[PDB]
Ligand binder design. Structure first.
Ligand SMILES: [K+]
Ligand SMILES: [K+]
Ligand SMILES: [K+]
Ligand SMILES: [K+]
Lengths: 254, 248
């Protein structure tokens, strides 16, 4: 119904206006801070180095940015058999970190066709893992559900206890335990690790934090595909969690 | 069934190995080219400018990168967190596109983004399902008018919907982004596909240029296109999924 479509639209538009105001309240002071810091650092380089013109400076910065955009650090491979495999995975899962992206015209063309047919192909694997996890957790939850049924507990509370039991159990295995590993391996903060997990498993994938992206960290070859395996089982868990939040939002709608 | 789950896994693993080899065949020679280009550009700067030491060169390059990571161009008044630009950022999280050209740098901004995504993505799901049902009624009533003419079929209707929607949601907006943002014909189509599949690399982001001073009607209209375009692409990717299930 169009009447209900307009209602959800008004809620979403308000939710975005609200979100945007909270984000600028938390981010605009830091943005202004970095805007002034680069203004000062560029101005002090032209003071200290008189043999450098303001135009020659901008040309160098542009050359450094062009290199960084291409996935090459302008300080001091991303397409190796393993790193390219994980890139492909990032496209198929719709995460799209963008820390690396195709620069070649042909690379962009192949990326279009690869995503179009690859994303539905993953959909089957994600639905398959989703059904398997629903059988593993489903059998474990039923064992607990039978215990409360004997205790004359209401059908309401049992379903509530089960929903909190599944979320809490999976949150340990797919969110907490991997974030502890990323905090130690990648060397991020407790917040930045949880932030990476949520941003990854929601398929948002900003690319500010990417597992196995540090030049200084020389971790073994098994880490990159193991991260992709965590993603595979973690996306199925998060899909169920986001579906339950949707289900609870439908309850609040009625 | 687990027997079919392992089968799809083997297909996906092969598809990734294949994909990775095609991507490196197209990208690794250019990567090596840019690796040598920055090496020579830095070496030429230190030759032409003797008053600059190799240490103070890396320090500025580092300062420039730090600024770019924070979403501030180290080139050359404009903001990324203004009422309108922050609204589009919120939209990017909710649609799961996540361009990442801008992302929260604050610990609090990161905390709020976790909660915002968790409750916001399902909220969008309803709006996307609602637009999906409405488009299915608009395109469904228009296809039935043509279907009645030939009766006096399902394959002919699928080709008609894909071609019609591809003009309205992919072709026409790509032409606008090529003129407004100033991208190539390829880069505009590439941006549209990367955006409407919710991949969102962030290499190309509408309303991201510092030099381009587009009005307050540009940034929200882009999200309005994202809103109706995601519903179209969701149906297209569902049909490709349906077609693959037939081949299975
Ligand atoms: K990104
Ligand atoms: K994404
Ligand atoms: K992304
Ligand atoms: K996505």
């Amino acid at each position: 119904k169009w009447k209900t479509v307009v209602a959800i639209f008004v809620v979403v538009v308000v939710y975005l206006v609200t979100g945007g105001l909270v984000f600028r309240a938390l981010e605009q002071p830091f943005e202004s801070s970095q805007k002034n810091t680069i203004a000062l650092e560029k101005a002090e380089f032209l003071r200290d180095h008189v043999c450098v013109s303001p135009q020659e400076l901008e040309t160098l910065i542009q050359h450094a940015l062009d290199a960084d955009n291409a996935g090459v650090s302008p300080i001091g491979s991303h397409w190796d058999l393993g790193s390219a495999f994980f890139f492909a995975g990032t496209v198929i899962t719709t995460i799209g970190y963008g820390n690396i992206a195709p620069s070649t015209e042909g690379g962009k063309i192949f990326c279009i066709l690869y995503a179009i047919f690859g994303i539905p192909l993953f959909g089957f694997l994600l639905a398959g893992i989703g059904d398997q996890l629903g059988t593993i957790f489903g059998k474990s939850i039923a064992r607990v559900e039978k215990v409360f049924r004997k205790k004359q507990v209401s059908q309401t509370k049992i379903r509530v206890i089960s929903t909190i039991l599944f979320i809490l159990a999976g949150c340990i295995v797919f969110v907490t335990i991997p974030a502890v590993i990323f905090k130690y391996i990648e060397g991020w903060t407790a917040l930045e690790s949880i932030y990476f997990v949520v941003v990854t498993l929601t398929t948002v994938g900003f690319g500010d934090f990417v597992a196995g992206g540090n030049a200084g960290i020389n971790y073994r070859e098994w880490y990159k595909p193991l991260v992709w395996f965590w993603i595979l089982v973690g996306l199925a868990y998060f899909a169920a969690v986001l579906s339950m939040i949707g289900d609870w939002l439908r309850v609040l709608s009625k």
